[PDB]
Design a protein. Structure first.
Length: 91
């Protein structure tokens, strides 16, 4: 368990892809969000000791046209959960 931001290209757009494809999950009715999906993203892996988990939290900020957004991805184990949900962005 230790890491953080990596790149500033796909790493961001990535969440954007699953963003609209997952926006439904955490929520109920997804929408359009491809205006400006990026913002200061970040990621943090989560490995046990001998490969008992090896999770990864993907936090992306989707700055769409209608406004600024952001989702949170987490895929850990041992006492975690794997899936994309978060999709907000306060002001």
């Amino acid at each position: 368990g230790e890491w953080e931001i990596i790149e500033i290209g796909p790493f961001t757009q990535n969440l954007g892809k699953f963003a609209v494809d997952e926006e439904n999950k955490i929520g109920q009715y997804g929408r359009l969000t491809f205006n400006k999906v990026i913002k200061p993203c970040m990621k943090k892996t989560i490995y046990e000791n001998e490969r008992e988990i090896k999770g990864y939290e993907y936090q992306l900020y989707v700055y769409a046209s209608d406004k600024l957004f952001r989702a949170d991805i987490s895929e850990d184990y041992k006492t975690r959960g794997r899936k994309l949900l978060r999709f907000n962005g306060p002001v």
